[PDB]
Every structure is written in C-alpha cells, then in structure tokens.
C-alpha cells in the first residue's frame, strides 16, 4: 500500500548476440540458476508481497508457474513487436499504479541492503534516490555532489560536450564547493514517487528514463523564478512538474554510493565470467543447503575437484576428470582423462575422453572430441567440436 515493485526485462543489448534471444533473458544460466531469481529473491527477503513484471509471451511460456516461491507473480504480456522503452512501458502500466513505485531490472546483482536507500528516501522526502557503484571509452559521465556527498548537484555526459563544461554562476553562490566524480557505474534502482509518472503521462518526448528523465529533473530542481524563468510555459511544456507539485524548491534529488561490496549489471559478455565465478561465494550464505554438485548427478571422479565445481542434475562423470572451479549443467556426459579449468558448461553437453579445456564456455548440444586442446571460446549450440584451436580474442564463430 506504500511501494509497488516493477521489474523490467525486455530486450538485451549489443554485447549479447546469442544469449538474450535463444535463451530467455531472465533465465540465462548463472550458477546453475536463472538470473532473474537473484533480484526477485531479494524482493522476497525484505518482505515484499506484490511484484509486477512485464515480459514477452515467450518468457511467459518459459515461466508459467514453474517456480515454487511464495510470491504470486503478475505477468503482463507486452507487445513483442515493439521497440519499447522505459517511459512507454511505465506509461502502459499506469492504470495499475496507485502508490510510489520501485523500478528494478533483472540484469542487476548486488548484495547491499536496501534499508539505507529507502531510509534516505523516507527521511528527506526526496523525489528520487538512485544508486552508483565505484568504477571497476563511451563518453564518460561526470557527476558533481556537494560537500556532504549525499545531494546530487550536477550531472552531464561527454557525448554532447565538445571540449569544456559550463556551470551557471548561481549554483556556487548557494553551494560554495562541489566535488566531481567520473568513474562510476549506475544501477537501476530509481525510487521515484507517484507525481513523476503523472507528469510524464501528458509528455511523450521522453522515451528512456536513464538518458532523458534524470537530466531534465536535476536541471530544473535548481533554478526558480530566476534563471529558468527570468533568463529563459505551462501550456507549452504540458503542465510542467512545478505546477504539478502542490502539497504541504520542492523537487530535491539525492544519491548514495558505496565503495566496498559487489554491485553490477550483466549487460556485457566480459562481466559474465566474473559473475559466474563470484556467485558461489554469495550462494554459500544465501542458500546454505545447496551442495556444489547436484544430488542426482552421476559422479565418478570425486577427488579431482577444484573449489566447488558446480554440477547440474543427471550429470555423468568419468574418472580422472580434473576440474578447477568450473561450471557444469544438467545431463552432461563426461569421459575419462578430461581436464577443465575455469570453464562454463550447461545443460546437455557431451564430452569425449582425453580432452583439455581452459577458460572456455560451452553451449547446448555440444560434443567434445578426443585430444581437444581448447583455450578460451564460447561454443555454439548444436555443433560438434574438433581438436585444438579456440581463442579468447579469436572466438569460434560457431
């Protein structure tokens, strides 16, 4: 009755080329579990009892009611034949929205408690409170915070900037000193109130919230009857937000950042292996009753194992199958004298004897051959494998 959670997962990105389409984006394999199970479980950890998620018909078919978690998901079938954006989708679900909203994206994984950001939203009646993680070229963005490092004051991107940045000579007379940050990574945790969606109902120019909503909001939160009116339109700007907010300098923005911990969104193929490598550490405390190897897996080589060696169900193993912190899915056949280091595997992978795989990835219906000296790849689906070859920079096309 106070917060409505909206989970967004429609469409992938340029870095994904064979995952978001062939496999459902929410159900991509990390830690032998679907990725969307990670944020959703967090929503069930705090105590949320209403989750609204929009997705396509294919994901709905792949989902139905297959999970046995207490939340009752409310799936709305978005039109698949669209180039939809955040603003348009939140425009769609507007009649079902009554209270403040909490937008989240499935690609995000973090371990930080949300009590801090919600406390910041509650205490200072802020319009919004986003999240940024310390950076770990694409027109680097610069954000300027005040001395206390809690209130956003400036934000810009290098895309429209040519060689310099300009600051109006009125901000400094109210905030004498500001601090700039360049290396940061955004997180989709926009905790905005009910008035913002009502304001954007009558304005159709905005299509993506990340690159269109926050810049205008932070630009307008500072100026007043002077500058934005003295130096520079209710009937032209479609009933501007200042005229909207009439309740008991009304728009204020705040941002929290943290320096230690893990918080990242898997939208690049590079971060995939860091994710699937570090997720067992989270799973050790998250689910302390999950063995590293599935119970119903046909294990033979129980002494050549490194760290955890995640293994799916019904997975036949061969003797002398050396493994070093590798990932293995379900229904995988493994023969003898096979060595695997820091590699990923998932459902229905067959392996011949005498193989050697180093830092690679394997897709569905892949048959490994004897004497295969593999050094980094991703491996296509429904294709057999030959000896040697494979590279990290020269990844196999198939």
């Amino acid at each position: 009755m106070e917060f409505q959670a909206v989970v967004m997962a429609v469409g992938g990105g340029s870095r994904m080329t064979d995952l978001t389409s062939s496999i459902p984006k929410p159900l991509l394999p990390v830690g032998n579990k679907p990725l969307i199970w990670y944020p959703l479980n967090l929503l069930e950890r705090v105590g949320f009892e209403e989750v609204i998620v929009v997705t396509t018909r294919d994901v709905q078919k792949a989902l139905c009611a297959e999970f046995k978690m207490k939340m009752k998901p409310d799936i709305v079938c978005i039109p698949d034949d669209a180039d939809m954006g955040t603003a348009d989708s939140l425009r769609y679900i507007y009649p079902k929205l009554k209270t403040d909203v909490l937008v989240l994206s499935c690609d995000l994984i973090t371990d930080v408690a949300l009590h801090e950001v919600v406390d910041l939203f509650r205490a200072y009646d802020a319009s919004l409170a986003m999240l940024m993680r310390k950076g770990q070229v694409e027109q680097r963005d610069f954000i300027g915070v005040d001395s206390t490092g809690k209130r956003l004051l400036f934000m810009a991107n290098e895309a429209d900037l040519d060689e310099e940045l300009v600051i109006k000579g009125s901000i400094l007379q109210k905030h004498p000193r500001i601090r700039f940050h360049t290396g940061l990574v955004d997180a989709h945790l926009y905790c905005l109130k009910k008035y913002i969606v009502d304001f954007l109902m009558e304005n159709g120019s905005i299509t993506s919230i990340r690159s269109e909503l926050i810049p205008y909001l932070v630009r307008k939160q500072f100026s007043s009857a002077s500058s934005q009116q003295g130096q520079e339109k209710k009937e032209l700007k479609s009933l501007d937000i200042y005229s909207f907010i009439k309740e008991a300098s009304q728009v204020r923005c705040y941002v929290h950042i943290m320096k230690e911990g893990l918080c990242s969104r898997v939208s690049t193929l590079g971060l995939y292996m860091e994710a699937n490598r570090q997720v067992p550490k989270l799973l050790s405390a998250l689910c302390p009753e999950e063995p590293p190897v599935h119970s119903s897996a046909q294990i033979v080589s129980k002494h050549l194992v490194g760290v955890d060696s995640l293994i799916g169900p019904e997975t036949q193993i061969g003797e002398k199958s050396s493994i070093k912190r590798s990932v293995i899915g379900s229904s995988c056949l493994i023969k003898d004298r096979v060595t695997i280091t820091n590699c990923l595997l998932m459902n229905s992978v067959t392996v011949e004897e005498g193989s050697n795989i180093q830092g690679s990835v394997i897709c569905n219906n892949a048959v490994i051959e004897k004497g295969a000296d593999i050094k980094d790849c991703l491996i296509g689906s429904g294709q057999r494998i030959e000896a040697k070859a494979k590279r990290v920079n020269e990844v196999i096309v198939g």
Partner: protein
C-alpha cells in the same frame, strides 16, 4: 557508562538505528508514522510545538485509513490499535507533556463516540474535532499572548532572551512592527548553539542586537532592564521546567535586581510535583561534548580511560520565588497563583 547519580535515566546514541530490523514494506507500524519517528532523531524539535503538530497530522492521516471490524466497534478497536504506535514512538525518543495532553484528549474524544453514526460520519467528526483543537489551542492563544505582552514594552528598553523559541520571536517582531524602538541581547550555550536562529531572525527583521555566551552573563546585566523567557511545562506547585541554564539566569538576575517574565500557553499545565532541579530529566549523547580543537582533540577515545564519565542534561526546574509575572491567554498573574486559577 552512566553516572551512578543518573543510573535510572536511560542513555541513548544517535547511531543505533532501529529501522534495520523490520520489513521495508512496513505492516506492523503505519508508514507515515515510521517516517515521523525516523525524523524525530534528526530534527523537527522546537518547544513541543512542531512535534505536537506533526503528531496530530500523522494521527489524522492514520485515522483516515481505517476499517471497522465486523464483530467490533471503533471505540475499543482504535484505542487498542494505537498503543504499539506511540509505544514505538516513545522508544524512538522520550515525549513531552504537551503530547501526553494531546493523546489524552484524543482518547477522551474517541471513547465518547457513539455507535449510531456511520464510519464516514465518525471519521469526519474526528477530523473536525482535531482541526478545532489545533486552531483554538495554539494560534489564537499566541495572538492573545502577544496582544497582552505588547503593553509591557517601552521605548529605550533593553530586553534579554535565551535560547530559541517561536513565541518570543513573534512577540518581539510584532512589537517592533507596531512602532516601538529598543534593542536585544542574545545569550547562547554549548553544544546545541540554538541562539543563532533567533539572532538571524532578529537581524533579518531589522532590530539592533548583540550576542554572547552564558558564562559572561554577569558582565552585561547592569545594562539590562527586563528578562523574557519561555517554558516547556508548568508544574502543580508553580515551578517552571525549561532548558538547562535558565535557573542560573534567574538567580543572577535576582541578584542584580531585574524583573523576570515567563510566557506560556494554558495547555501545558502538568500535574507533577518536583522539589529540586534533578531526578526526572533526560540524558543525551555524550560524544557531542567533544571539542573540535582542530589539533589535539581532547576526550578522544574517552572510553579507554578507566574512570571518566560525561554528563549531558536537558532540563532544569526553577522555583516560583524567582519569577515575578506569568502571561497566559487568560491574562497576567503572579507565579504562586498559577495552580489556584488554572485548575478550575
């Protein structure tokens, strides 16, 4: 690590946040009041005036969203439901006498409600009663008090004030606007330093003013002509409870032959009795006492030393023998006549 003298009184810190131990979608406690309790530990404290207004607003909002139980009436259900709420609010920070009187009045109003009316009618009646209470008991009383006190200010006077209080600032601004000329002296004390609010307000108004600290109070009393003070509560025997340091000012002013005036409303009259400026007080965070010396900050890691305690009181009590006049919405009376008149 409390003082053995103040062992009974509880000591709390400002960094033991209680919000970590319940769900973000709060269901045990109404979210608006959770926000209010969170804000209680940051600010929104001014002479139990803003706090009472905020509490009444939150109570009105809570009453707005209510459902009548099928096998119960409003009178018992609401009363039984409200107890954990202000119990948790008390857990956040100790209350004040004005809030106790307000909640007593609200409970009395709730009990008297009959079952003939509908739920909506009862809700509207309760909202109207609360609005009437806040309108009658605060604003008009302040206007009447200002009108009464306008007659005790003359040209060429020097008035002394202490701390921050809305009533005194309102009185002084109204008197200056009415066309009278005088000047003011402000006295401040560590560690809150709340006199700067009054100093800024007076400077913006256009009144000459001077500023200084409490220990030099005996230096400037030969020039002063009147002393004007606010209050937080009024005890049965006629004593006045205020921020720590008021009794010192009263004593030194009495020693220098200067009259003392106290301003208060009639809804802060308490039924407690106290005979000394001790015993029933409230402690605060001791870490605020650390002086920002810049270099070699003393008292750092004060818990390391074996025997070392820091004391931080909030209140004190002034006996009625040091007060010459009390101004309320009913008029001006001597201090010792307070209980006989107001008790009714």
């Amino acid at each position: 690590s409390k003082v053995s003298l103040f062992s009974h009184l509880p000591q709390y810190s400002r960094q033991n946040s209680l919000t970590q131990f319940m769900s973000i979608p709060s269901s045990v406690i109404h979210p608006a009041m959770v926000r209010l309790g969170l804000q209680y530990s940051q600010g929104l404290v001014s002479g139990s005036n803003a706090r009472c207004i905020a509490l009444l607003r939150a109570l009105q909002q809570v009453i707005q969203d209510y459902t009548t139980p099928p096998n119960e009436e409003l009178s018992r259900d609401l009363v039984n439901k409200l107890k954990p709420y202000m119990s948790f609010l008390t857990q956040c920070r100790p209350l004040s006498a004005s809030m106790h009187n307000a909640i007593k009045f609200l409970n009395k109003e709730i009990t008297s409600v009959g079952s003939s009316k509908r739920e909506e009618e009862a809700k509207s009646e309760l909202r109207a009663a609360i609005d009437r209470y806040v309108q009658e008991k605060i604003v008009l009383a302040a206007q009447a008090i200002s009108r009464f006190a306008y007659q005790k200010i003359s040209n060429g006077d020097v008035i002394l004030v202490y701390g921050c209080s809305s009533l005194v600032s309102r009185i002084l601004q109204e008197a200056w606007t009415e066309g009278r000329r005088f000047r003011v002296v402000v006295v401040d004390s560590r560690p809150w330093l709340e006199g700067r609010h009054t100093l800024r307000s007076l400077v913006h108004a256009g009144v000459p003013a001077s500023y200084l600290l409490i220990p030099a109070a005996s230096y400037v009393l030969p020039e002063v002509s009147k002393v004007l003070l606010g209050a937080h509560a009024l005890l049965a025997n006629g004593s006045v409870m205020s921020r720590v340091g008021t009794a010192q000012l009263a004593l030194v002013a009495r020693a220098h032959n200067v009259p003392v005036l106290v301003c208060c409303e009639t809804y802060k009259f308490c039924e407690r009795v106290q005979t000394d400026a001790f015993v029933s007080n409230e402690l605060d965070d001791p870490d605020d006492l650390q002086c920002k010396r810049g270099e070699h900050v003393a008292l750092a890691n004060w818990q390391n030393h074996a025997s070392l305690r820091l004391l931080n009181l909030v209140y004190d009590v002034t006996p009625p023998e040091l007060v010459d006049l009390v101004i309320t919405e009913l008029g001006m009376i001597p201090c010792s006549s307070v209980p006989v008149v107001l008790r009714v």
